[PDB]
């Protein structure tokens, strides 16, 4: 019933890596695309409220990591089983590094999308469509992090 | 991670703010989403420390 004394180490590393790596992915999504905002806006100041969609899609990636970091931090107890702690560790890596991938993908296509939108606004209806498919990579990692922390 | 985001956007944002003052409304709006990464790290550090 009662687990070993070292058992809570792995599940804690699932709580931290779900927040560290997802914020690192949301760092690249905000920084790489925020560079593209200031480079575009010197010639087209009108599109500056429409172009902040790649930086809020990266913000959802942080909340994807914030939720499961709460989910793991509420399944924690003194002397949990070693089976349960590996679940929360495998849940945390599957949302952090996947959100790291989705955040790195949002930052690249968000930066390149707002550069070409300054030269043609017809890219704007296509830029969001590629930004959708980059954002579901975080959601795919989220829904597998939930099914690992459910058990 | 949050200091990386404020570092890059704070660098390139004040370059475009001089050449155009219209960016100032947009620049501080990106810095909101740049700072909450450290703020989201707070409330998970809080909820881990109450236990």
């Amino acid at each position: 019933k009662n687990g070993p004394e070292y058992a809570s180490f792995f599940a804690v590393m699932g709580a931290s890596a779900a927040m560290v790596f997802s914020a690192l992915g949301a760092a690249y999504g905000t920084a790489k695309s925020g560079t593209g905002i200031a480079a575009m806006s010197v010639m087209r100041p009108e599109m500056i409220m429409k172009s902040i969609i790649p930086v809020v899609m990266a913000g959802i990636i942080a909340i994807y990591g914030l939720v499961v970091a709460v989910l793991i931090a509420n399944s924690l107890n003194d002397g949990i089983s070693l089976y349960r702690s590996f679940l929360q560790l495998g849940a945390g890596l599957s949302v952090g590094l996947s959100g790291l991938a989705a955040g790195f993908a949002i930052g690249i296509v968000g930066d390149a999308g707002v550069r070409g939108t300054a030269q043609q606004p017809r890219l704007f209806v296509g830029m969001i469509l590629i930004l959708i498919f980059a954002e579901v990579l975080g959601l795919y990692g989220l829904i597998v992090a939930l099914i690992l922390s459910t058990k | 991670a949050a200091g990386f985001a404020i570092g890059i956007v704070g660098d390139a944002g004040v370059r475009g703010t001089a050449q155009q003052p219209r960016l100032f409304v947009g620049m501080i709006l990106i810095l909101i989403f740049a700072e909450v990464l450290g703020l989201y790290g707070l409330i998970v550090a809080l909820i881990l420390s109450t236990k």
Binding site: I60, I63 | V36, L39, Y40, L42, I43
Partner: peptide, 27 residues
């Protein structure tokens, strides 16, 4: 009916998950 569904969905969710981040940023 087409654009008022998708554009006002942005106004709802940025209030909805925004209110938690607004609450947390008062720390």
């Amino acid at each position: 009916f087409g654009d008022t569904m998708v554009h006002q969905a942005i106004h709802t969710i940025e209030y909805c998950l925004g209110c938690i981040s607004n609450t947390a940023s008062y720390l």
